[PDB]
């Protein structure tokens, strides 16, 4: 947040707390909009044997 020191002090004193610590506007701390590919595991019924449907 690009607010001057005097404005920061005034808003902090009017609010009664430190506002720069917990800002309601988002900045570079959010995750990137491009992400690596996922791998996405499979479930328990993905066996090649001992996996008859009548038992599950």
């Amino acid at each position: 947040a690009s607010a001057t020191r005097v404005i920061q002090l005034l808003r902090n004193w009017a609010s009664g707390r430190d506002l720069q610590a917990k800002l309601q506007l988002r900045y570079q701390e959010i995750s990137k909009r491009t992400q690596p590919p996922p791998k996405l595991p499979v479930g328990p019924s993905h066996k090649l044997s001992n996996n008859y449907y009548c038992t599950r």
Binding site: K47, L48, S49, N50
Partner: protein, 215 residues
């Protein structure tokens, strides 16, 4: 069968008791034996029913190539019967009941012996390919499943598969056996089961070696 019909008149001429004197109970008579594979003297011979396998090989076939210690496996009753390793081959008799207790069956008494210088997976896969080429295609379990077994077996020889599949293959064979019209499906399922049961470490080692070689 030809042998049954051809022995009936001698049984009539000489008596049922004379024929029944040979072999154990419920295993009477004299049976023709074919010895082939890794023996010094492959031959066809007539001999008493309940002969030991080792005795038969060492007496009539001249022994297994490279001595008895060189034996790896035997298919005792034709390709349909499952194979048995040396440990059980040492003291097994040649008749229906004794060979059933060894989880094989007497079959047609066609002994095919293999020493330790042959690829057991390749031999079983060749038998499965024979069965794939011989099925009539009438019923779906034999047709489809024997083709599937053939494809899986070819990969197994290479070692291109994974360890988890072996169990898969075992399950597939079970599905075929007892569900087909005739016993060709059983005769294709049993050799695979015998190979798995007695040589799973060889399949696992081949798969591991392939995986190491291919990264």
């Amino acid at each position: 069968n030809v042998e049954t019909v051809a022995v009936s008149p001698t049984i009539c001429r000489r008596g049922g008791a004379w024929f029944a004197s040979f072999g154990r109970e419920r295993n009477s008579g004299t049976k023709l034996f074919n010895i082939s594979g890794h023996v010094n003297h492959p031959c066809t011979v007539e001999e008493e029913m309940s002969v030991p396998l080792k005795e038969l090989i060492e007496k009539h076939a001249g022994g297994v190539i490279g001595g008895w210690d060189n034996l790896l496996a035997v298919i005792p009753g034709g390709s349909s019967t499952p194979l048995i390793p040396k440990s059980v081959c040492e003291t097994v008799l040649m008749d229906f009941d004794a060979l059933v207790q060894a989880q094989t069956g007497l079959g047609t008494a066609a002994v095919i012996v293999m020493d330790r210088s042959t690829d057991i997976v390749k031999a079983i896969a060749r038998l499965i390919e024979f069965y794939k080429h011989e099925s009539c295609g009438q019923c779906t379990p034999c047709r489809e499943g024997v083709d599937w077994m053939n494809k899986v077996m070819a990969r197994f020889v290479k070692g291109d598969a994974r360890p988890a599949e072996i169990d898969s293959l075992w399950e597939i064979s079970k599905q075929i056996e007892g569900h087909t019209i005739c016993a060709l499906g059983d005769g294709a399922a049993w050799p695979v089961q015998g190979l798995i049961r007695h040589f799973r470490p060889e399949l696992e080692e081949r798969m591991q070696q392939f995986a190491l070689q291919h990264q």
